[model samples]
Target: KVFERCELARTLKRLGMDGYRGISLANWMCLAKWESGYNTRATNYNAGDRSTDYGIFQINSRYWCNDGKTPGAVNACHLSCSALLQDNIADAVACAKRVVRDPQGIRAWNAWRNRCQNRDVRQYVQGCGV
Candidate 1:
């Protein structure tokens, strides 16, 4: 998963989060490894896209996917519907990072896991043992 890890590391670094809150590269890798395993192509199939979310951060675009022609552009990227569906990964990661920088977003992510604890959070991870 070196390549996958590097992809996420690069994405995080691009967001200028390598220093904020002391979330170092290694730490970021650890978190990403745990959360979604740097799986840009990963997504939840059972709960559906909006319900289960998608991409590396597992962003739920339904709440934020409205108010625009884009599929999930309301709050995430503000892009058109076509762009949202066509380029959701780039926009999703960007949106996820933007939210994570906020205290609420981090809290939500944590709470979401607990709320949906029974759901499969390891869909993005390669090893079930993780």
Candidate 2:
């Protein structure tokens, strides 16, 4: 399901992402906007190779998720990439947490690196009171 910004914030908070692993909800929410425009079904293909990014956080088939078609996919999340396309974000959230646990922290997301890296995204959840 597509989410309003505030609704998305509340959902992220409800999922314990307000500060999960020291990555703030506002940061993830901002990443979600640039990564998928809040669309759960969002997907992107990489012209560079067989890599594909899936869902709101853009989990990649190169490692985090299995697209089935992409052979040698690590599937570190231990699930199909299609699972990230579901309206329920539980799996995606769980996978994203794993992504942040890496040494890169939030830098694992290109969108976060390019857009939200040093910006003040506290406004992303300001009025939501999450």
Candidate 3:
């Protein structure tokens, strides 16, 4: 993935996200496969709200697109489309890593790995499984 090859390692290191290193790269690859195969232009439509979202991370375009005057900024939501820029491997890595390393982050990662036992998923705890 361009994001991983170009910015993952450097971005994490710069942010002192060393604890996320173990599953950082692998988790990203898994997310990409699960979430549209790394397609930067991917989007998801919520039937309930009748809305469309975009990007590899599937950000809502109307809210995230780089339209200077009317960007749908999610400031209160604590996320920005700037992190979902097409080639922003660092941002993607950071976002995914935080999900894994935060309080219940890796616990969920482990649960998913155990339930699915999918070889495509990365196993974080050694004795648990591989």
Candidate whose TM-score is highest: 2
- Tens digit of lDDT per residue, candidate 2, span 52-125? 99998889998899887776768888888989999999999999998888899899987898999989998898
Tell me the spans in candidate 3 whose CA falls farther than 4 Å from its real position.
Answer: 1-24, 49-54, 59-77, 106-130
- Which whole-number lDDT from 0 to 100 does residue 52 have in model 1? 40
Ordered list by TM-score, greatest first: 2, 1, 3
Report how far off residue 31 is in candidate 3 (Å): 1.6
Question: Model 1: how far is 74 from its true place, Å?
Answer: 5.7
Of candidate 1, the 10-residue stretch with the lowest lDDT total is 121-130
**Residue-by-residue lDDT tens digits, candidate 1, 3-48:** 3645555655676656455334444445445456556545553344
Q: Give the clashing pairs for model 3.
A: 3-89, 54-59, 63-72
Task: Look at candidate 3 and tell me the lDDT of residue 14.
Answer: 58
TM-score of 1: 0.51
User: What's every prediction's RMSD, in angstroms?
Assistant: 7.4, 0.9, 7.2
Which is the winner by TM-score between candidate 1 and candidate 3?
Answer: 1
Candidate 1 error regions (>4 Å): 20-27, 45-50, 66-90, 111-130
Error of 2 at 53 (Å): 0.7
lDDT for each candidate structure = 0.47, 0.90, 0.45
